[model samples]
Target: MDYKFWYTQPVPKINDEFNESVNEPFISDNKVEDVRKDEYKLPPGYSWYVCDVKDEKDRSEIYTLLTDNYVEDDDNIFRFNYSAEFLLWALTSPNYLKTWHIGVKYDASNKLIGFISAIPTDICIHKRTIKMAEVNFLCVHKTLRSKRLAPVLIKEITRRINLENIWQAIYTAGVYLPKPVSDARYYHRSINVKKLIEIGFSSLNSRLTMSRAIKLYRVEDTLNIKNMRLMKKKDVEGVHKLLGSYLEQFNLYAVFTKEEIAHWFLPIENVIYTYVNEENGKIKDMISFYSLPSQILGNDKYSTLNAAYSFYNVTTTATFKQLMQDAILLAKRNNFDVFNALEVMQNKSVFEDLKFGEGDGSLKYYLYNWKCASFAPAHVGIVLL
Candidate 1:
């Protein structure tokens, strides 16, 4: 469908009523500059609409757009269906809105043409501390590429970040891109080399599998494991222990405290689903999934489930498999058409074993304003939450 181009306009207000429904106004000041809407001349036949998903149907439509066009082979495609739930969570959760998400729309025949979004991520790296926005899911229709909407969308989101007083943004791109304005190196640990080989992954002039003595295990069934419950106030200690156990093994990790874990994983309004695997009354493992959908699609007639990110699958080897099985089962039961696990840990065998292949190496995780964050020198996208 052809999109319409409305006249480019500056943000209407800088500190207007905090649109609780939208998690905007926090960065409204950044929108004051006309630069945000200046990337390209509007095509003759299209109009642009700068709006947020505030209703149920609009959110659904946005979800469909995200899922249907979701990238699979591109390294930039971090995970399948990643944007669907991430956007939804950003828009619907009050805590998330305060520091993240700025989505723009293009309408032609009243259809969304292009979109881009960003979110707040407290990046602790290299002994620095800084609040940064992680920009992601910058997408435009293939036919609409001529308009250069991707840059415009990114700039606008940056404007919002500026208004919120956030000084920096971080992102990773496999292909060269100018928006991120910086680059960081990456390291990967593969546990399933055969699967990687099958998918055409090669390193060091030979296959990557020849160098390591990796062990493989079958995923255990989780259907019979009962007593799974949402995270609670009392479970913080166990969760912390699980995280501690895994932190040292990985090159990168997000070490959220118990309080931060509660805020990050179980805030009252966000759609965070965390399950605990217990055996004989002892907590053995934990699996948490966060769902985010676009607010603008709430009014659309159709319904869809999009997974933005999967978090904190900390567990013992057996527990880990059970969690994966449970996750697949949950997705199936909910009729979730697609699941996107962004930048999942390379050491985890589940992604490879399930025949889920990695995308072209396009996604990069960056440490923006690295001077103020604390992270391991070897940290990479695998630690992204």
Candidate 2:
């Protein structure tokens, strides 16, 4: 496949040197005034619109576009259903720009058909903290996919970010693109085995029976960690310090402020869930996962597959495997149908012990303008929704 659009971008190429030593943007910081004064031209019938996720009407529109037309499995068995609450929490990160939540509207009927969002963040590459935007939710209406609106969306988002004078960005996709900075395979641990098998999200082999499969994935009803409880305001400083210290080993990761940590890691009913083990007035361990349920394509028995994607975690008391087992227990108790993790961090070590089956799909990581050498999945410390 010809990545004609990607080739024109600043990402590294297969033939290019690994460039492990360089950790800077391919293009220098752009002057705000010198940045494009106009939005990228859209098709004749479409126009640019800034989506205000705070507004109930605009929020529903963005939610609807992603719910129906976003990430789908290869067999089309399931599609991602990023709930409205999750979108609000994700897009409205601390100090997020409203202008960065961009969308496209059809002129005649005024229907939203395209969208891409960027939120300001500080990403630590090597040891340097570079301001960047975590670009995400790039979607084009299924009917207009062949119209080549995705590249325009990317270009417009890039332009918008540049206008803010932030030149570097990070994003992930299920599809392969030119020069992934790092790639990670998704791992799944079943919580509701019968429902998963019935929905075709998983299957029973000739040698495996439903009862045996369910027995194989059974988890403890209680958490393994002592004094485990939902994270609160007092735990913010500790979690910040612990996570910051733990993530230093990664070649690339996000740098979070105390405020950002509070915003991202605090317990939100159905949005983000974080738990910490506290002993003697100090935090010993932390684990988190965000809810990202998928819509069942055509299953009669189920309409949604509640999945918990493993988020940031740090442990000083319990083993990584045991800590993750506790995470699975939490997800199971919370009614998540499955617990999904990546091969990043210390996640792979626990899969075999915990009965997490290998997923067929892989999520690729990309940087918009930064150049860096490829690294192993274990080096990844950031988990974007």
Candidate 3:
């Protein structure tokens, strides 16, 4: 757990006074006008390329690189399959800069060997708007990692973002880096109990019969929401207002505009799904989640564990319990294998009693150049894919 690279950065060092609760950027000597003019020095026979996601060729290259080597389980079991369409939707949101999509190519064959990107997404902390990079993929090819090239890939992106005067970043991971600013843990709701048991994703509770177990976690015949339906462009104006006010209550959240809503909230096949409740000509609640399937490694019955990650949700009329129960059944209806939610925002209220099993791995949130001492899952908002 020694952090050689992070130790020298602006982020809080492991030994720093994490109890201070200061909310200012760590001081940096580099000035905007004096930013580095040349590209970061790469190892011999390696080169840098700005991934233009708008271009199909560049998009495919980046996608191929990630699909091949992005992230895999510790046992090399389930690998994340971040699809090309998902990349396009995620990389090019409102005000996203293509130049920030950086990649390193092996000069001999022009193959993309490294990748990192930061979308200029503003994060709201209470009343303060902290301009930051929603730091995305930071993957260096496995071949390069053997030579300790990941540090270079991380720094290159940091240098690129710094040149634009953005010294702050918001990212999350499973391990400890420079002290965490907040905490979030995973909770899984088994959708297909039969398949889950078959795949070892879940096990039956003690003394529970197979028939009882099947009926216990069974997907209800109908969705529980009274008036829940798909979110549409027409609902964008309403949902935007609903989300903004609701999210403002959290200590850490991402600010969203109408365009961002249309991009993120509007249903995209195999990517994101959002639903809303309308009563008396007014939208009262919003529930949404995004799709990221893990490539199941060892099950003859299935090859993919369809996962729906908890996104932003705002509720007034519908109880958080009812809203989420409805949400899971909908996911089940759509053939999802599991429903995943971090115990953040209003999720704790729902997950504790919603039949979700507590998971071991916890995602740690880190903020560069800022401090949120003693922050907890309930105090944070926003989901980072």
**193-253 per-residue lDDT for model 1 (tens digits):** 4433333332333333344423322223346356666667677777767765665454334
Ranking by TM-score: 2, 3, 1
Residues 1-385 of candidate 3 have per-residue lDDT tens digits of: 7787888888887867654446666775658787677787888998889899989999999988887788775557677878778888899989888889999889999899999888988898655797889887888777767676777777777777888888888888877788887778889998877877877777776687677777878766675667889898889988888898888888888988788888889998888899998777677898898888877776677788888888887888868898898889878777788899998888888776788998877888888777656577898888898
- CA deviation > 4 Å runs, candidate 2: none
Ranking by lDDT: 2, 3, 1
Top lDDT prediction, candidate number: 2
C-alpha RMSD for every candidate: 11.4, 1.1, 1.9
* TM match of model 2 to true structure: 0.98
lDDT of 2 by residue, 1-385 (tens): 7788888988887566566788777888568998888888887989999899999999999999998799898788899999999999999989999999999999899999889998999998767899999998999989887878999998988988888888888889998888888899998999999999999888998789999998888886877796778999999999998898998899889999999999999999889999998887788899999999999987777899999999987889988888999999999888899999999988889989889999998989888788778888999888999
Candidate 2 or 3, higher lDDT? 2
Q: Give the winner by TM-score.
A: 2
For model 1, the local distance difference test gives 0.48
Instruction: Supply the TM-score for candidate 1.
Output: 0.55
Pairwise TM-score winner, candidates 2 and 3 = 2
lDDT at position 10, candidate 3: 82
RMSD of 2: 1.1
